[PDB]
Design a protein around this ligand. Structure first.
Ligand SMILES: Nc1ncnc2c1ncn2[C@@H]1O[C@H](CSCC[C@H](N)C(=O)O)[C@@H](O)[C@H]1O
Ligand SMILES: Nc1ncnc2c1ncn2[C@@H]1O[C@H](CSCC[C@H](N)C(=O)O)[C@@H](O)[C@H]1O
Ligand SMILES: COc1cc2c(cc1OC)C[N@@H+](C)CC2
Ligand SMILES: COc1cc2c(cc1OC)C[N@@H+](C)CC2
Lengths: 347, 351
């Protein structure tokens, strides 16, 4: 009700950044109050309830209404906001000199390091995005056989096209929905960068993925998380505007750092890392600098995409919201609440 | 320099029973505080990396070290002493106090019931009790699941003693007891439910131990585990520094590990976690406290017993204050910060 006018102000870009950030922190602080429990017994039971609950769901509900609101994004826009590698996920900022572009590379190298990728292997990039990791792995290891899987077509066409121009003869893009796709091939490395947040039955999904791992192969998983608790992105109450601010409810789950430790039926954990929230926070902060600095080019292309001025404005302030959501959320408490998690699995 | 010698004087005062209970609790809390400080990390990244350093280093060890010198200093205790210090079932592990007026006996019973609930024992099952102690669980499960066939495993000639005798004395078919080093025991038998109550703390290489135990699980069988823990970090029970007198006060060096509550989540190569609970440190705190009350109230019968077992009053004194420090260590460690630091973890595994 009284949030209906806040959402409207945010749409019209009336609320300045300082004010936005503080209103967001208020919402985060309320989420921590909600998520943290007085006794560790309860805290653990809340993870046990969510794990058991997801085990009676389908691999992912509402699969490509997610992929037409987001992910079917103009390439030309993502080239403005994202870095050169078009990484649509956490980047890694070692030092403060670290630009967005280096931060992209740093994170991608770390993946290859931590997934233990060697020149002649089959490599599978599930939820490939704009192909940042696929192209990286292809340029880096000439004899690797990379297969990037997406359900989008704007993504598929770009990666295919980009391979050709970068002259990467070892990339293969496969258009499919992973929730229902079955493939009889098998791979030495499987890589999943921030896909699981959109899915539900991690048991069925990891059972499905476990079979695409050849013997002695490995599955590498990045997911954002909270340090301690886990939850569906669903409003706390009548006053929570932040949860559905950017992601439409039902599209998102925020795992605990330990979450997929509870899903080791068909894969077994080998290694586990986490990584400060300040990394994704700066990533978002550089995505935001990128919008605001290129408004002059963004407005006219938004203005033609939405044949309209009623709405070119709402879409630009949507993307600010995205950025400021990630900036403050993962930034919260010097990066020690919401953060990223890296898990390495064998069969 | 003199702080090394200050410590050794403290240790002998404790052996001689010259330090009042409150002074002991105060000093223990100071070490505890310092372990928390050494344990917690300023970034979560460093915290998780610490768990990985330990999970990985254990995988290169053997299943257990100091095995028979653990069965000698501890776990070969005269039963006559245990019936005084422990409650009716001689449970030498965490009991469950739901209400402020829960007795020790009641509390033993409540934990034992909770094990059967969480391991989902059912009247027609084959049950293996690894590291059975004085068989508090074996006898309990045996009793009113008459068509179970409980099997207890111990490397302690004194523990095989008491169970076999007290199991025919209560007119029980089911109970069978085997004397074996679990570190080296192989067996071609196979069980619907394997219960492990506070055994792993003495082990090292958990990947090798759990590989072995899973081979003893029947199809659709379960593994139920209890281990004490700290909620966040894990560690070998080795001294922080030279001023740490508490870490080796009770348990011999290199015989104990304190896992994180999350620890065995990382040892799932041959088993698979189905459920996971923790349980407030107030239960084991209160348990150790009820044990301590039972000592002091029966010094009249414990003193001659310890004289008879030792050869001289000097060592009988040292021994009774040993057991006091056992229970005091337990009280303060697990009751620390209202029981939300050191505590008990329950894990249910399938094959
Ligand atoms: N059900 C599904 N089937 C196939 N691909 C999916 C999918 N759901 C989401 N995706 C893809 O997975 C990606 C998750 S966002 C991650 C982007 C990319 N992995 C990167 O690192 O930059 C989206 O870009 C989308 O293309
Ligand atoms: N290496 C080893 N092999 C077999 N048993 C061992 C062992 N190390 C310790 N134990 C046994 O494991 C138990 C740990 S104390 C727990 C006692 C019992 N489970 C109870 O709850 O009452 C003791 O009985 C000890 O004798
Ligand atoms: C900006 O906030 C978020 C950004 C992203 C994610 C989650 C965010 O906040 C929870 C998920 N990744 C899959 C895509 C990027
Ligand atoms: C009293 O402190 C402890 C008691 C016991 C344990 C650990 C204790 O302190 C860490 C372990 N169980 C195996 C045996 C009982």
């Amino acid at each position: 009700a009284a949030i209906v006018e806040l959402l409207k102000q945010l749409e019209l870009g009336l609320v300045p950044y300082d004010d936005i950030k503080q209103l967001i922190r208020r919402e985060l602080a309320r989420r921590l109050q909600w998520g943290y429990k007085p006794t560790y017994e309860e805290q653990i039971a809340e993870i046990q309830n969510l794990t058991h609950s997801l085990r009676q769901m389908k691999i992912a509900t509402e699969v490509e209404t997610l992929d037409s609101q987001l992910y079917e994004i103009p390439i030309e826009f993502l080239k403005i906001m994202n870095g050169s590698n078009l990484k649509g996920s956490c980047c890694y900022f070692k030092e403060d000199s670290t630009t967005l572009d280096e931060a992209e590379i740093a994170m991608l190298d770390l993946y290859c390091e931590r997934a233990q990728i060697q020149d002649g292997q089959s490599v599978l990039d599930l939820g490939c995005g704009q192909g940042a990791l696929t192209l990286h792995v292809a340029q880096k290891y000439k004899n690797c056989r990379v297969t990037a899987v997406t359900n989008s077509v704007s993504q598929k066409e770009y990666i295919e096209e980009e391979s050709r121009r970068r002259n990467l003869l070892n990339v293969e893009v496969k258009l499919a929905d992973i929730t229902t796709h079955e493939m009889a091939e098998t791979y030495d490395r499987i890589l999943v960068i921030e896909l699981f947040e959109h899915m539900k039955n991690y048991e069925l999904l990891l059972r499905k993925i476990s079979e695409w791992i050849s013997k002695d192969g490995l599955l590498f998983l990045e997911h954002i998380c909270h340090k301690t608790f886990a939850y569906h992105y669903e409003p706390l109450d009548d006053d929570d505007w932040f949860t559905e601010y950017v992601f439409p409810a039902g599209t998102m789950i925020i795992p605990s750092a330990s979450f997929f430790l509870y899903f080791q039926d068909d894969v077994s954990v080998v290694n586990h890392w986490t990584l400060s929230g300040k990394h994704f926070s700066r990533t978002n902060e550089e995505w935001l600098k990128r919008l605001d600095a290129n408004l002059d080019v963004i407005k006219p292309m938004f203005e033609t995409l939405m044949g309209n001025e009623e709405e070119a404005v709402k879409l630009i302030n949507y993307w600010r919201g995205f950025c400021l959501s990630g900036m403050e959320m993962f930034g919260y408490n010097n990066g020690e609440e919401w953060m990223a998690s890296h898990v390495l699995f064998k069969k």
